[PDB]
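Researcher: I'm comparing several assemblies side by side, and this is the next one on my list. It has 145 residues spread over three chains. Same procedure as the others: predict the full complex and return the structure.
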Amino acid sequence: YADSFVIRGDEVRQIAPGQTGKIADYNYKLPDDFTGCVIAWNSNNLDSKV
Amino acid sequence: SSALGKLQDVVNQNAQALNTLVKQLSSNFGAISSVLNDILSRLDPP
Amino acid sequence: FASVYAWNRKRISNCVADYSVLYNSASFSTFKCYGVSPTKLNDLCFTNV
């Protein structure tokens, strides 16, 4: 399965098994025996607009 | 009426072992406490 | 606030502490709990904070 979304820059540390915070609490929660991989890259020029 | 040490000895050895078994329910073995209601109250499941 | 080499020390005492207003305030850049995970603070009692 591939899940996709957009978050802040310093919220990428809550996408991991066993974390807390406004993102992992109630936006997107990863089980505690996760198996896959997590990939993330900056996208300032595409998603941020004056 | 005024010698049964073999029997006494047996009856005793068993009590000394059963007490040592229960007295081990209060050691940490390298944990924060000896109570499961204390590790299930100040720690998250992971 | 207080310097780093002479920190302060307030001894919170008998009261009704609501660590939820802290935990969810989202204004904190770092909120780590060590002896006890944060959500179970509003369900325990100690002697002195």
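Model: For your comparison table: Helices of chain C lie at 19-23.
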